[PDB]
């Protein structure tokens, strides 16, 4: 079930049993790469890149067509962010609820949810520093988080 | 399931959990606390010896009953003061005051056998000679 709640939903997406090239596609094999990178210079995080490619240009998923996923392509062109997607978004959410708790002290529900969010941040940063994607400590903190998000 | 670790590297938890739960026993606690070596009426030994301090007349009911009275005795070694059970009538005139009796247990691990409460020991020897054979007129009691 959910890591920090009692919910037990299974709503996800179901990849087809096909590791090649839908027959109706016949667009290109290389044009999608510069499509990806020119979306990436606009300031698009690869979840947005993937949903744009599957909503406007008919790319079913980038890995089956290009051969490489979107992290791999952006790192191949040297556009990798200094922290990954989900860690950045988790820090942003913690910063926003920290600002909200600063201006409203008596929100104990917000306090509890901040506790859960920061524990999630700690677990995910520890994973990234186990594989040494991050520097060996990188030390998530309180004030330098708000300094980090922007 | 079952609430205990079933891992192949999970023996230290099972060991210490058994240690604490074993501490919540009865025989284990009275064995490893030295309870027979601090607060037993005896020293934790089998028999003991004592002199007769008085002879208390406990009775089951009104005097239209059976006579079951016995002595109160302090120990020789520890100096503790207990009460014993002399056997049935005809042996009550055998025991005297300051009579050097040898005592054993009664037979329920510190609980009272029969319907006599407050006693835990039965007289095995009186005057340092016997008690059963002195009943069966097979040997007499020496004087002092």
């Amino acid at each position: 079930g959910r890591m920090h709640s009692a919910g037990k939903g299974i709503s996800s997406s179901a990849i087809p049993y096909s590791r090649n090239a839908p027959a109706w596609f016949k667009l290109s094999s290389e044009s999608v790469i510069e499509q990806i990178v020119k979306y990436a210079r606009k300031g698009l995080t690869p979840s947005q890149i993937g949903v744009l490619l599957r909503d406007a240009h008919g790319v079913t998923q980038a890995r089956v067509i290009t051969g490489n996923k979107i992290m791999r392509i952006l790192k191949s062109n040297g556009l990798a962010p200094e922290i990954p997607e989900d860690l950045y978004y988790l820090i942003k959410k913690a910063v926003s609820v920290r600002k909200h708790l600063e201006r409203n002290r008596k929100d104990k529900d917000a306090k509890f949810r901040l506790i859960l969010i920061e524990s999630r941040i700690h677990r995910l940063a520890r994973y990234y520093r186990t594989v040494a994607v991050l520097p060996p400590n990188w030390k998530y903190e309180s004030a330098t988080a708000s300094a980090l998000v922007n | 399931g079952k609430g205990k670790p079933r891992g192949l590297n999970s023996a230290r938890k099972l060991r210490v959990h058994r240690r604490n739960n074993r501490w919540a026993e009865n025989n284990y606690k009275k064995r490893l606390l030295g309870t027979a070596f601090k607060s037993s009426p005896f020293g934790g030994s089998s028999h003991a010896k004592g002199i007769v301090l008085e002879k208390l007349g406990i009775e089951s009911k009104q005097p239209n009953s059976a006579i079951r009275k016995c002595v109160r005795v302090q120990l020789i070694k520890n100096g503790k003061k207990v009460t014993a059970f002399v056997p049935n009538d005809g042996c009550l005139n055998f025991v005297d005051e300051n009579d050097e009796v040898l005592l054993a247990g009664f037979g329920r691990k510190g609980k009272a056998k029969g319907d006599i409460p407050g006693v835990r020991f039965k007289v095995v020897k009186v005057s340092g000679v016997s008690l059963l054979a002195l009943w069966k007129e097979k040997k007499e009691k020496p004087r002092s």
Binding site: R19 | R6, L8
Partner: protein
């Protein structure tokens, strides 16, 4: 979480055989599950199974035939020295002439009679009768 896929597979087989179906479905599938089912099948405890191949992990549809009393897994996989294998048989088999306990030895996954015939041992895996 799914700490053991073999345990859930053997539990599903037990529930289907006790309830009375003739085909059962097992998700996920594993090499160790496949070899356990092959060892159970070679003695005729189950019928015939096939491996549905989705790209992710695979499923197994087993065709039972009755004549299966009880299959189980032993967890954790204890290290079994050879001179103790027979103890395990006397621990959890109905009689000395039928019933098989499954070992994962370095010669593969086999029953205990083949384990002593080849004079090798390993870890324990489960049992069937």
């Amino acid at each position: 979480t799914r700490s053991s896929v073999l345990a859930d597979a053997l539990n599903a087989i037990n529930n289907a055989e006790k309830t009375g179906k003739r085909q059962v479905l097992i998700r996920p599938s594993s090499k160790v599950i496949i070899k356990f089912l092959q060892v159970m099948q070679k003695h005729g405890y189950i019928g015939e199974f096939e491996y549905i191949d989705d790209h992710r992990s695979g499923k197994i549809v087993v065709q039972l035939n009755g004549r299966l009393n009880k299959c189980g897994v032993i967890s954790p996989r204890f290290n079994v020295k050879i001179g103790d294998i027979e103890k395990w048989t006397a621990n959890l088999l109905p009689a000395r002439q039928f019933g098989y306990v499954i070992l994962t030895t370095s010669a593969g996954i086999m029953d205990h009679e083949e384990a002593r015939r080849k004079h090798v041992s390993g870890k324990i895996l489960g049992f069937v009768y």
